[PDB]
């Protein structure tokens, strides 16, 4: 993975030695070159993973997450260069260095062969994200939101540290390749009960679990646009990646430990979706929709069937692209009206027709329109949870009504109706903004032509 | 109830509004034109029977039971004009009512497609931005202390001056753009 | 009663300005000042070339693979003759004639 | 379709409806013929005249605007304002 780690590190002298008018264009160019090189991870086999070294490997789970991670950095640079145009030059370079450092932590989070190196990178991803939210967020509440984002994660994850070192002492290793072959059945006990909780609650916070999700509609709202893109597109998927690695070690106890959490997600995706019906803050509406979509990934991991893991990784990649595009659209209005209130600027299809087409496509992929990979992941999780219990389709289908209802109401409030009369600074869409929308949406629609690369280790 | 300049509804206004609503709902009930014309004269006779009532409490009571009569005998789907609220063509063209300030956002190569129109627009813009401070100082020298009582705006009390707060009434979009 | 003279004068002045605006919405005859800019071609470009492409795709890439185009076998009647073999299907029994 | 309205056409149609109304003689009538002060018409008659205007031109005048139309010229000018004539 060192062919991806060293170019990401060389982005640091690339961004600190550039000319002052050149520090966006060079980083965008070479991050796009790294994302072009990211397709060499697709050397995946039907039997074996692509095992690079003692430290790094990549199966078909980490590979779409790595391509999405290396693809999201140029899009974050495009999104975050307008509102940081008036910024000091050294602080602008520090912002770009925090995004580069976060990508550098993420690409060896997803490729960590050993689980405590996974933990170290997985918790190293806090510090650039925390600094970005609490330094380049706009409002007052970013300090409090950074505290919530920090201390839900660490309160969930410092038990995970003790649990991983306990597995290290018991099994002798935390190599995932060794633990594929040395995994022992985890019997029913209270010791193994709190073992399961210490392995799972950090990722339950990262997904987020409903009830633990309170950090998210602050940390995804009080952040700048690049922070919201990396949080909702990648950093919610560290939890699903970690669960799909760690439930190997937690059998057969998971088969009854999952029952409360599944309820917390199956009811949670009813509640949070319903919350999106009555949100005034558009960025908070996208945040509670993110909680609603990640509840399905929690259910699909906790029922641990093949169709569920395929649908869960498809839904994670699809939700990454979709929610990142939705945050970028909310920023495209917020750079014009300077308020995140959704009822403020209405009827924007009368003024921005192509941007309203981007809103339409993002909302149709949000409501899981076939044959988008949003619907592929949605539908496969629905199939596997129907095999889990035939009643859950009700809680699925009612969700699939409300998921439609907030996706179009967001379209109806922002883009339709009569426009707001007193707002007259609605500029035409810049080429940068439509470029960002197309670089979100065109990969998302091209993946419908060949979805087997985003279906994970057991396609 | 709710009016821009008046603070209430007089008894005379309530009677006229009830009379018009009763004739409209009656025309909804009485589809054919001769038959509605007959029953409209009968209802006009019913309104003319109590026209000379100088007792205001008796007249207000008759208005009240006439409203009860109306609420009983209304059509469930009354006729509504198409561009009237509740009509089938109401606020249909609001998606075509692009505001005028968006013309300030055009590219010069598409402003040069209509040179006479924008050359004629810039003098409207100049006229408005010279009229603005005159109509602000006209509003503050005519509004009473405590603010304006009603929403009624004054006309231009000089010659050459424009009426205060005139731009969005004059430059409103057409009904059929 | 109706309007007050303040309302009359204001609505008259607004009416005059509105009519001047609507007049100034008109078009000059030189406007729009534009920048300086095979009979059955529809049956060739939208029909015949797509029939060529789709027949090439079905003949040399779809039917070359098994079970991609599965046709129902043709309905066989008494008295038919098989083109591949020449086997005559024998007719039915003579009818117990009803009318 | 949809032929445009002119002030001459709106004036002719408004006076044409008022000439078809039996409480108005057609030779006394002009565009300034006030309904209560010149024609001597009732307020109920003014409401019926505005309803005949609505049934003539095919749109609804609200009552807060209907109760101020007390001459034919104000009716013609209101229809001019709500149909945007002489573009």
């Amino acid at each position: 993975m060192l062919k991806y780690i060293i170019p990401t590190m060389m982005l640091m002298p690339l961004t600190w030695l550039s000319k002052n008018s050149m520090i966006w264009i060079n980083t965008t160019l070479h991050s796009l070159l790294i994302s072009l090189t990211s397709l060499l991870l697709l050397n995946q086999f039907g039997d074996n993973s692509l095992n690079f070294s003692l430290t790094f490997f990549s199966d078909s789970l980490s590979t779409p997450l790595l391509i999405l991670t290396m693809w999201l950095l140029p899009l974050m640079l495009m999104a975050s260069q307008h509102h940081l145009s008036k910024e000091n030059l050294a602080r602008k370079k520090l912002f770009i260095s925090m995004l580069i450092l976060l990508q550098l932590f993420l690409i060896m989070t997803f490729t960590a062969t050993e689980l405590i190196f996974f933990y170290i990178m997985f918790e190293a991803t806090l510090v650039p994200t925390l600094i970005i939210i609490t330094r380049w967020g706009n409002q007052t509440e970013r300090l409090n939101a950074g505290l919530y984002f920090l201390f839900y994660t660490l309160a969930g994850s410092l038990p995970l540290l003790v649990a991983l070192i306990y597995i290290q002492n018991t099994m002798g290793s935390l190599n995932f390749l060794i633990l594929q072959y040395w995994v022992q059945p985890m019997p029913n006990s209270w010791s193994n009960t709190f073992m399961w909780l210490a392995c799972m609650m950090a990722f339950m916070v990262k997904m987020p679990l409903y009830g633990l999700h309170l950090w998210l509609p602050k940390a995804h709202v009080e952040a700048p646009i690049a922070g919201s893109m990396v949080l909702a597109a990648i950093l919610l998927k560290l939890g699903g990646y970690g669960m799909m690695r760690i439930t190997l070690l937690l059998n057969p106890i998971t088969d009854f430990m999952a029952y409360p959490f599944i309820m917390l997600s199956l009811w949670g995706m009813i509640m949070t979706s319903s919350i999106c019906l009555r949100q005034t803050d558009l960025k908070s509406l996208i945040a509670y929709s993110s909680v609603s979509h990640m509840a399905l990934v929690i259910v699909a991991i906790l029922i641990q069937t093949p169709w569920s893991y395929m649908g869960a990784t498809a839904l994670m990649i699809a939700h990454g692209l979709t929610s990142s595009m939705l945050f970028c659209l909310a920023n495209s209005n917020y750079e014009r009206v300077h308020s995140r209130t959704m009822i403020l600027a209405r009827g924007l299809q009368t003024l921005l027709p192509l941007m309203a087409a981007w809103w339409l496509l993002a909302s149709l992929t949000n409501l899981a329109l076939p044959p988008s990979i949003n619907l592929i992941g949605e539908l496969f999780v629905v199939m596997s949870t129907f095999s889990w219990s035939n009643i859950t389709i009700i809680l699925m289908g009612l969700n699939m009504v409300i998921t439609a209802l907030y996706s179009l109401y967001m379209l109806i409030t922002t883009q339709r109706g009569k426009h707001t009369h007193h707002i007259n600074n609605i500029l035409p869409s810049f080429t940068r903004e439509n470029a960002l929308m197309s670089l979100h949406m065109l990969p998302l629609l091209l993946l419908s032509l060949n979805p087997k690369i985003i279906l994970g280790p057991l396609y | 109830a709710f009016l821009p300049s008046a603070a209430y509804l007089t008894h005379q206004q309530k009677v006229l509004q009830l009379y018009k609503r009763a004739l409209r709902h009656l025309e909804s009930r009485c589809v054919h034109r001769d038959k509605y014309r007959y029953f409209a004269c009968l209802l006009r006779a019913r309104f003319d029977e109590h026209k000379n009532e100088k007792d205001m409490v008796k007249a207000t009571q008759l208005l009240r039971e006439a409203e009860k009569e109306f609420w009983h005998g209304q059509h469930p789907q009354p006729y509504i004009f198409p561009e009237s609220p509740g009509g089938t063509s109401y606020e249909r063209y609001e998606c075509y009512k692009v505001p005028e300030w968006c013309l300030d956002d055009w590219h010069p190569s598409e402003k040069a497609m209509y040179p006479d129109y924008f050359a004629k627009r810039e003098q409207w813009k100049k006229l408005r931005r010279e009229s603005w401070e005159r109509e602000v100082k006209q509003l503050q020298e005519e509004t009473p202390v405590g603010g304006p009582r009603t929403e009624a705006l004054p006309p231009a009390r000089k010659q050459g001056d424009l009426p205060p707060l005139w731009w969005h009434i004059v430059t409103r979009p057409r009904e059929r753009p | 009663s109706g309007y007050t003279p303040d309302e009359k004068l204001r609505l008259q002045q607004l009416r005059e300005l509105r009519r001047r605006w609507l007049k100034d919405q008109e078009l000059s005859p030189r406007e729009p000042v534009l920048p300086p800019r095979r009979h059955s071609i529809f049956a060739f470009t939208h029909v015949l070339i797509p029939v060529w492409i789709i027949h090439y795709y079905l003949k040399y890439h779809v039917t070359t693979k098994p079970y991609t185009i599965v046709e129902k076998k043709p309905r066989i009647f008494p008295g038919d003759t098989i083109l591949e073999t020449g086997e005559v299907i024998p007719p039915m029994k003579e009818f117990p004639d009803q009318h | 379709d949809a032929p445009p309205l002119t002030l001459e056409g709106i004036k002719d149609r408004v006076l044409y409806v008022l000439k078809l109304y039996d409480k108005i003689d057609p030779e006394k009538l002009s565009v300034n013929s006030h309904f209560m002060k010149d024609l001597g018409l009732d307020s109920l008659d003014q409401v019926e005249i505005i309803m005949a205007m609505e049934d003539e031109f095919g749109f609804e005048i609200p009552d807060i605007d209907a109760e101020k139309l007390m001459c034919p010229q104000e009716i013609v000018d209101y229809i001019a304002d709500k149909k945007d004539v002489y573009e």
Binding site: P353 | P99, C102, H107, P177 | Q25, E26 | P4
Partner: peptide
């Protein structure tokens, strides 16, 4: 004749 201007947003960009 009597061709009227159509106010529309900037379709250039």
């Amino acid at each position: 004749g009597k061709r009227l201007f159509i106010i529309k947003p900037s379709g250039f960009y």
